[PDB]
Amino acid sequence: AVPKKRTSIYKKRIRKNIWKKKGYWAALKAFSLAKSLSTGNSKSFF
Amino acid sequence: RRNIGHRQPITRIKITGITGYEDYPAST
Amino acid sequence: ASTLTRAEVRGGGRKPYPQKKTGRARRGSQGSPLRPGGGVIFGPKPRDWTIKMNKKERRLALSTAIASAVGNSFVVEEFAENFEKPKTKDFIAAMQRWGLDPAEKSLFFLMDLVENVEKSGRNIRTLKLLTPRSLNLFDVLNAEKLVFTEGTIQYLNQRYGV
Amino acid sequence: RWERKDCKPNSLPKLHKRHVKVGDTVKVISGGEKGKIGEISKIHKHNSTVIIKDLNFKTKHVKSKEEGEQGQIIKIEAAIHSSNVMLILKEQEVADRVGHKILEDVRKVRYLIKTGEIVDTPDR
Amino acid sequence: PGKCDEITTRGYSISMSVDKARRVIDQIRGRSYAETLMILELMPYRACYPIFKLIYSAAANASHNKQFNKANLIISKAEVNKGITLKKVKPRARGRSYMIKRPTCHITIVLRDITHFDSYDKFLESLTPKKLIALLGLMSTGRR
Amino acid sequence: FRLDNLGPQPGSRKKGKRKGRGHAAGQGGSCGFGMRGQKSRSGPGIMR
Amino acid sequence: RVKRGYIARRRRKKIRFFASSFRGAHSRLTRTIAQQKIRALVSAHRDRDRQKRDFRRLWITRINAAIRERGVYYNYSKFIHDLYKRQLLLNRKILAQIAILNPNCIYMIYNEIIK
RNA sequence: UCAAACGAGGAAAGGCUUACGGUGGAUACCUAGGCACCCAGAGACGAGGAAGGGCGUAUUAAUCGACGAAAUGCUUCGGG
RNA sequence: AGGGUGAAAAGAACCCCCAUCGGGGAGUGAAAUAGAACAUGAAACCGUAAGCUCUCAAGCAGUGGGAGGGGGACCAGACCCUGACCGCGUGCCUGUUGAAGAAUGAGCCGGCGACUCAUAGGCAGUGGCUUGGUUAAGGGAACCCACCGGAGCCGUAGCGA
RNA sequence: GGCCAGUGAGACGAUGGGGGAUAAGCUUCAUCGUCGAGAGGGAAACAGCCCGGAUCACCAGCUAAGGCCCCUAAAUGACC
RNA sequence: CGGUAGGGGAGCGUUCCGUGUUAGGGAGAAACGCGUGCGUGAGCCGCGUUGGACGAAGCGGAAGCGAGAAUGUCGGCUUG
């Protein structure tokens, strides 16, 4: 359970950039919702 | 542990021309 | 120069944490010298020593310094002073006329220490008066330009003869 | 600012002895605003600094009111040090040092050491 | 310096973590003020709102300090750095105590108008270099 | 002789060797006392 | 008589500058910068002596592959048979260099080794 | 056009180098504060209430110093 | 445990974002990249931009050779950066007969951190006197010191309880 | 002789033996070689086996031990 | 002319002191960072759109004098 050693700058920038790329994937969805929130007949967002 | 260094005493030579070579030709 | 060793500081003379069952070194004092909170090793005690040097080696050191002082035009020579109204202008004027700059760090000494040259000489920085009561080697081995009087050249030959 | 507060022997601040009184005509000797005459206005004995009129220009910005109105820009003098000034008589225009003449009465007055007049002002 | 093109806006050490501010700041890089205006209206992050406040107070800055428009204005770099981290000695069981660090960011966002010349043709002219300093202000692949 | 140009003769004052300042100096590491024993430990050591 | 210094940082900054392009904590981290200076210099030793050895090996196999292009069974050993019997003192395996920079001239070398 | 051979060219996090930044307070220059000697001097004080404190005193916050219902000070004699 | 903006707070009038904190202009200043977390600011650490390059690859991460590519260049053959691939290479210290060791130690970076001082004996090297050598305490223009101060010490004769 | 250190846990290999079970990379001795304190080459790797003793440089040549099909330098060499 | 424990010889660096109110230095000292330079090396010398007031060399002396190790220690910052 206890880690034997530490990680490099290598593997850490890989994992942190996979985390922040996983943050990248959930804003073109927000760009699509922000673009559909604009002028148009949409039956949502009262 | 031993840090020593070595600067080899070299000499640069420029070449003028080659002569005195006109014996026993061996062309193929 | 002084420093406080391990036995002097007001740090703890206690065991801070026990000997085992803790992953940390065996540190038995908070005034330990390994810890920068106090306590040093092998620092300067205030030492008032006695470096003795031989008499006839030191007399020969003075005689060698004054002996190498003359010959290379570093010695001109005066003989008398009579300074009524001691006012440091005839002192620096006679200093100029003897061939000595006031800034070039000369040194010169006189018999009996008459008061009107101690009074007119102690303000210029580059020279200080001496006397056979107070003739050292370090002040005279500046050796730029240095003069004698006849009682100091015949007292000086009177002592350091042959 | 504890490095610059006043030193206090027995709770009272150590005040310096100086050579400039109020109502005197000082000249700036060297630093900055060199070579211009002036009266002095307010005195600061602990810094050995003196504010003098209409020469030292410190354009300062003041939030004026509490309603946020008119916010005035006030051009206020600062403290030049007391060793950077001399005294001036208006008869001989020359910056001179000081001296304490003891005249025929008991009082002891200031004196320009090169000219022959007295800095000291009477009761008015 | 790019000859008077960009607008640099710094930020206080705001009371949040640097890494989540770096995913929300690595989203909005390269996109202009309208797209970041509509995305940061609707991004589901708590780190979204001071970033949107600094973009809004950065392009309003770019329209009041300079005199630009909020449509021809792309985000240039938008770098987020570390700040001061507080230390919180929080106790935990079996007589232990853990340092819980309260992290702060340091946001510096640079904005970029297009103040262009848009020259007619490409063809090089190796004459009058004191005009070649001014005609070329921001291009690519600089030879010699 | 000036204060400048004075210098002792060679051999008159050797340098005191410092111990534990590097193995190239000569007495680094264990400072010239082997590995262990009473000769390496600090204290009065052995009665002569 | 306190003696705080800076000489460990120049001592250490020189070794820091030598350890460039070491891929990670061998190029940044001081307590490995030292042993990569050390191991890099002994790598320079053994790879220098074995670059003498290794280029010897490379010229041997290169002129062997040049001589074996005749087809008839003439090995590299027979080229030295009739390279020292016909008295050619020490061409120093630089005929493995002009064997590719001057292949007609090495054909003149070998075709005069035959005669 | 088809069949066969090769896998270039731009391709991602990242790796190295370089440049510019942020946390950080080593190095350099100080000091506002200490340490140790030498030469003198003093080791005094206190029931005439001590060393040390508590509370309080200024026109008006807190803290320190000074002071004690005569309180951010008083009388006399000198210096200024 | 926490010192150092400037020379002088001259500590930012006014405009914009705005609930503040903060930020940008403008103004002060020689310096505002000296802005109150404020003097030089290094390493570990976190980043961003530019050049080369990694997704059939086994490696104490190097080193020797160097494909391809990039940069300025002037002794344009040189220099620096990247690294297709090949050979070779069992972290450092401690301490053992023997440690890459799966023996110990260290997360990392920067500082602090260890044969030192007093007085004696012995030996070596450099001196000063050999009309044997040398003073201690103490006196001294505050200290050091010139010059005294021959008390003592060492060598001059050994053998024996 | 003067001054002045360490070391006093050894290991394997050949020979001469004792203990053992002529078992142990076992234990104790006697002469020697290596390692310890010895790099390089051969031994696939591998302290003690063979050659061999590293001041340093060369993109020099000849060899010892050992090898000459390929990985990996040199003979798919010749004759019994 | 390999070398551990160890012994000897010769040197570099640091801060302070004598020369020293040294040469030099707001026409940029120390620092910090840099090298197509020189050394056997510890290191020197030179260059810096950073920094802002000190301080070399030579000839000498004295050390709280040199860091990668102590489950060292004190701050800073990582890993998970």
mmCIF file of N, CA, C and O (backbone and C1' of nucleotides) in Angstrom, chain D residues 1 3-4 57-63 68-73 78-79, chain I residues 3-15 26-29 38:
data_model
loop_
_atom_site.group_PDB
_atom_site.id
_atom_site.type_symbol
_atom_site.label_atom_id
_atom_site.label_comp_id
_atom_site.label_asym_id
_atom_site.label_seq_id
_atom_site.Cartn_x
_atom_site.Cartn_y
_atom_site.Cartn_z
ATOM 1 N N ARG D 1 9.613 49.892 10.558
ATOM 2 C CA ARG D 1 9.800 51.306 10.852
ATOM 3 C C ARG D 1 10.335 51.419 12.287
ATOM 4 O O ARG D 1 10.700 52.498 12.755
ATOM 5 N N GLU D 3 13.150 50.204 12.982
ATOM 6 C CA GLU D 3 14.531 50.561 12.689
ATOM 7 C C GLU D 3 14.751 52.066 12.584
ATOM 8 O O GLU D 3 15.908 52.501 12.586
ATOM 9 N N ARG D 4 13.685 52.869 12.487
ATOM 10 C CA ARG D 4 13.817 54.304 12.300
ATOM 11 C C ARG D 4 13.072 55.142 13.331
ATOM 12 O O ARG D 4 12.998 56.363 13.163
ATOM 13 N N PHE D 57 9.780 70.343 -3.644
ATOM 14 C CA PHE D 57 8.468 70.164 -4.260
ATOM 15 C C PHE D 57 8.124 68.683 -4.256
ATOM 16 O O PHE D 57 8.710 67.906 -5.017
ATOM 17 N N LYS D 58 7.179 68.293 -3.407
ATOM 18 C CA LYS D 58 6.709 66.913 -3.348
ATOM 19 C C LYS D 58 5.220 66.905 -3.663
ATOM 20 O O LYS D 58 4.383 67.120 -2.780
ATOM 21 N N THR D 59 4.904 66.659 -4.930
ATOM 22 C CA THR D 59 3.530 66.605 -5.414
ATOM 23 C C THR D 59 2.881 65.339 -4.876
ATOM 24 O O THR D 59 3.128 64.241 -5.379
ATOM 25 N N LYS D 60 2.057 65.473 -3.840
ATOM 26 C CA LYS D 60 1.428 64.315 -3.228
ATOM 27 C C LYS D 60 -0.058 64.269 -3.552
ATOM 28 O O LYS D 60 -0.700 65.303 -3.797
ATOM 29 N N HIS D 61 -0.583 63.048 -3.549
ATOM 30 C CA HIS D 61 -1.955 62.761 -3.915
ATOM 31 C C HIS D 61 -2.737 62.419 -2.655
ATOM 32 O O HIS D 61 -2.353 61.510 -1.912
ATOM 33 N N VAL D 62 -3.824 63.143 -2.410
ATOM 34 C CA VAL D 62 -4.608 62.988 -1.190
ATOM 35 C C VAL D 62 -6.042 62.659 -1.571
ATOM 36 O O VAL D 62 -6.676 63.406 -2.326
ATOM 37 N N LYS D 63 -6.548 61.536 -1.060
ATOM 38 C CA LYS D 63 -7.986 61.301 -1.051
ATOM 39 C C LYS D 63 -8.617 62.319 -0.111
ATOM 40 O O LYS D 63 -8.449 62.228 1.108
ATOM 41 N N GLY D 68 -15.855 60.799 -1.671
ATOM 42 C CA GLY D 68 -15.162 60.539 -2.916
ATOM 43 C C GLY D 68 -15.282 61.681 -3.900
ATOM 44 O O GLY D 68 -15.691 61.479 -5.048
ATOM 45 N N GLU D 69 -14.929 62.891 -3.466
ATOM 46 C CA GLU D 69 -15.107 64.087 -4.280
ATOM 47 C C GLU D 69 -13.844 64.933 -4.261
ATOM 48 O O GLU D 69 -13.261 65.162 -3.196
ATOM 49 N N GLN D 70 -13.399 65.316 -5.461
ATOM 50 C CA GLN D 70 -12.428 66.366 -5.785
ATOM 51 C C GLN D 70 -10.972 66.039 -5.456
ATOM 52 O O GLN D 70 -10.085 66.765 -5.916
ATOM 53 N N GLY D 71 -10.728 64.975 -4.676
ATOM 54 C CA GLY D 71 -9.469 64.246 -4.539
ATOM 55 C C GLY D 71 -8.127 64.949 -4.654
ATOM 56 O O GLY D 71 -7.217 64.378 -5.254
ATOM 57 N N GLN D 72 -7.983 66.131 -4.042
ATOM 58 C CA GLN D 72 -7.059 67.177 -4.493
ATOM 59 C C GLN D 72 -5.597 66.734 -4.561
ATOM 60 O O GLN D 72 -5.146 65.859 -3.819
ATOM 61 N N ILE D 73 -4.870 67.346 -5.492
ATOM 62 C CA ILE D 73 -3.445 67.117 -5.690
ATOM 63 C C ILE D 73 -2.730 68.259 -4.981
ATOM 64 O O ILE D 73 -2.779 69.405 -5.436
ATOM 65 N N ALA D 78 9.078 68.855 1.613
ATOM 66 C CA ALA D 78 9.606 67.769 2.428
ATOM 67 C C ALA D 78 10.820 68.249 3.211
ATOM 68 O O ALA D 78 11.211 69.416 3.154
ATOM 69 N N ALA D 79 11.425 67.314 3.936
ATOM 70 C CA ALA D 79 12.456 67.628 4.915
ATOM 71 C C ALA D 79 13.834 67.458 4.290
ATOM 72 O O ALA D 79 14.232 66.344 3.937
ATOM 73 P P G I 3 13.095 37.830 9.115
ATOM 74 O "O5'" G I 3 12.962 39.384 8.786
ATOM 75 C "C5'" G I 3 12.208 40.246 9.624
ATOM 76 C "C4'" G I 3 12.864 41.594 9.776
ATOM 77 C "C3'" G I 3 13.220 42.310 8.486
ATOM 78 O "O3'" G I 3 12.116 42.969 7.899
ATOM 79 C "C1'" G I 3 15.065 42.380 9.941
ATOM 80 P P G I 4 11.943 42.983 6.303
ATOM 81 O "O5'" G I 4 13.025 44.040 5.811
ATOM 82 C "C5'" G I 4 12.961 45.394 6.230
ATOM 83 C "C4'" G I 4 14.130 46.189 5.707
ATOM 84 C "C3'" G I 4 14.373 46.118 4.207
ATOM 85 O "O3'" G I 4 13.571 47.037 3.482
ATOM 86 C "C1'" G I 4 16.420 45.836 5.383
ATOM 87 P P U I 5 12.109 46.634 2.949
ATOM 88 O "O5'" U I 5 11.859 47.633 1.738
ATOM 89 C "C5'" U I 5 12.268 47.292 0.425
ATOM 90 C "C4'" U I 5 11.989 48.408 -0.547
ATOM 91 C "C3'" U I 5 12.846 49.653 -0.399
ATOM 92 O "O3'" U I 5 14.107 49.520 -1.028
ATOM 93 C "C1'" U I 5 10.572 50.266 -0.664
ATOM 94 P P G I 6 15.384 50.317 -0.469
ATOM 95 O "O5'" G I 6 15.133 51.822 -0.921
ATOM 96 C "C5'" G I 6 15.135 52.187 -2.292
ATOM 97 C "C4'" G I 6 14.592 53.581 -2.483
ATOM 98 C "C3'" G I 6 15.285 54.673 -1.689
ATOM 99 O "O3'" G I 6 16.486 55.117 -2.295
ATOM 100 C "C1'" G I 6 12.948 54.896 -1.451
ATOM 101 P P A I 7 17.862 55.093 -1.467
ATOM 102 O "O5'" A I 7 17.468 55.707 -0.053
ATOM 103 C "C5'" A I 7 18.410 56.438 0.717
ATOM 104 C "C4'" A I 7 18.036 57.897 0.800
ATOM 105 C "C3'" A I 7 16.579 58.194 1.112
ATOM 106 O "O3'" A I 7 16.327 58.163 2.506
ATOM 107 C "C1'" A I 7 17.343 59.574 -0.673
ATOM 108 P P A I 8 14.894 57.719 3.072
ATOM 109 O "O5'" A I 8 13.958 58.971 2.772
ATOM 110 C "C5'" A I 8 14.161 60.211 3.432
ATOM 111 C "C4'" A I 8 13.363 61.309 2.781
ATOM 112 C "C3'" A I 8 11.875 61.039 2.655
ATOM 113 O "O3'" A I 8 11.178 61.362 3.843
ATOM 114 C "C1'" A I 8 12.724 61.818 0.583
ATOM 115 P P A I 9 10.190 60.291 4.514
ATOM 116 O "O5'" A I 9 8.797 60.590 3.810
ATOM 117 C "C5'" A I 9 7.778 59.602 3.772
ATOM 118 C "C4'" A I 9 6.737 59.923 2.732
ATOM 119 C "C3'" A I 9 5.299 59.648 3.168
ATOM 120 O "O3'" A I 9 4.394 60.565 2.542
ATOM 121 C "C1'" A I 9 5.812 58.349 1.271
ATOM 122 P P A I 10 4.515 62.170 2.672
ATOM 123 O "O5'" A I 10 5.078 62.588 1.242
ATOM 124 C "C5'" A I 10 4.741 61.794 0.116
ATOM 125 C "C4'" A I 10 5.178 62.387 -1.198
ATOM 126 C "C3'" A I 10 4.830 61.533 -2.406
ATOM 127 O "O3'" A I 10 3.495 61.699 -2.848
ATOM 128 C "C1'" A I 10 7.103 62.081 -2.511
ATOM 129 P P G I 11 2.574 60.413 -3.135
ATOM 130 O "O5'" G I 11 2.146 59.888 -1.687
ATOM 131 C "C5'" G I 11 2.821 58.803 -1.048
ATOM 132 C "C4'" G I 11 2.224 57.471 -1.424
ATOM 133 C "C3'" G I 11 0.860 57.161 -0.796
ATOM 134 O "O3'" G I 11 0.031 56.506 -1.754
ATOM 135 C "C1'" G I 11 2.366 55.416 -0.335
ATOM 136 P P A I 12 -1.563 56.701 -1.707
ATOM 137 O "O5'" A I 12 -1.975 56.841 -3.235
ATOM 138 C "C5'" A I 12 -1.744 58.049 -3.941
ATOM 139 C "C4'" A I 12 -1.593 57.793 -5.416
ATOM 140 C "C3'" A I 12 -2.702 56.966 -6.049
ATOM 141 O "O3'" A I 12 -3.805 57.761 -6.449
ATOM 142 C "C1'" A I 12 -0.600 56.065 -6.650
ATOM 143 P P A I 13 -5.226 57.639 -5.710
ATOM 144 O "O5'" A I 13 -5.883 59.074 -5.923
ATOM 145 C "C5'" A I 13 -5.372 60.216 -5.251
ATOM 146 C "C4'" A I 13 -5.693 61.490 -5.992
ATOM 147 C "C3'" A I 13 -6.890 61.433 -6.924
ATOM 148 O "O3'" A I 13 -8.125 61.573 -6.244
ATOM 149 C "C1'" A I 13 -5.076 62.562 -7.981
ATOM 150 P P C I 14 -9.328 60.542 -6.520
ATOM 151 O "O5'" C I 14 -9.599 60.666 -8.085
ATOM 152 C "C5'" C I 14 -10.208 61.824 -8.640
ATOM 153 C "C4'" C I 14 -10.069 61.853 -10.141
ATOM 154 C "C3'" C I 14 -10.641 60.655 -10.881
ATOM 155 O "O3'" C I 14 -12.038 60.753 -11.088
ATOM 156 C "C1'" C I 14 -8.466 61.111 -11.689
ATOM 157 P P C I 15 -12.948 59.431 -11.162
ATOM 158 O "O5'" C I 15 -12.562 58.759 -12.556
ATOM 159 C "C5'" C I 15 -12.911 59.378 -13.786
ATOM 160 C "C4'" C I 15 -12.514 58.530 -14.968
ATOM 161 C "C3'" C I 15 -12.973 57.083 -14.929
ATOM 162 O "O3'" C I 15 -14.327 56.918 -15.306
ATOM 163 C "C1'" C I 15 -10.701 57.165 -15.570
ATOM 164 P P A I 26 0.740 55.126 -18.709
ATOM 165 O "O5'" A I 26 0.317 56.537 -18.106
ATOM 166 C "C5'" A I 26 -0.495 57.438 -18.842
ATOM 167 C "C4'" A I 26 -1.253 58.355 -17.918
ATOM 168 C "C3'" A I 26 -0.410 59.073 -16.876
ATOM 169 O "O3'" A I 26 0.201 60.248 -17.376
ATOM 170 C "C1'" A I 26 -2.284 58.089 -15.827
ATOM 171 P P G I 27 1.742 60.563 -17.049
ATOM 172 O "O5'" G I 27 1.737 60.992 -15.514
ATOM 173 C "C5'" G I 27 1.173 62.229 -15.100
ATOM 174 C "C4'" G I 27 1.096 62.322 -13.596
ATOM 175 C "C3'" G I 27 2.411 62.147 -12.851
ATOM 176 O "O3'" G I 27 3.176 63.338 -12.789
ATOM 177 C "C1'" G I 27 0.773 60.771 -11.866
ATOM 178 P P U I 28 4.779 63.265 -12.731
ATOM 179 O "O5'" U I 28 5.095 62.735 -11.263
ATOM 180 C "C5'" U I 28 4.838 63.536 -10.118
ATOM 181 C "C4'" U I 28 5.370 62.882 -8.871
ATOM 182 C "C3'" U I 28 6.828 62.459 -8.930
ATOM 183 O "O3'" U I 28 7.714 63.525 -8.648
ATOM 184 C "C1'" U I 28 5.523 60.682 -8.072
ATOM 185 P P G I 29 8.991 63.775 -9.584
ATOM 186 O "O5'" G I 29 9.954 62.554 -9.247
ATOM 187 C "C5'" G I 29 10.493 62.393 -7.944
ATOM 188 C "C4'" G I 29 11.020 60.997 -7.732
ATOM 189 C "C3'" G I 29 11.999 60.479 -8.770
ATOM 190 O "O3'" G I 29 13.315 60.968 -8.589
ATOM 191 C "C1'" G I 29 10.382 58.822 -8.321
ATOM 192 P P C I 38 7.854 41.857 1.135
ATOM 193 O "O5'" C I 38 7.696 42.966 0.001
ATOM 194 C "C5'" C I 38 8.014 42.685 -1.354
ATOM 195 C "C4'" C I 38 8.133 43.953 -2.159
ATOM 196 C "C3'" C I 38 9.432 44.721 -1.992
ATOM 197 O "O3'" C I 38 10.478 44.203 -2.794
ATOM 198 C "C1'" C I 38 7.587 46.211 -1.853
#
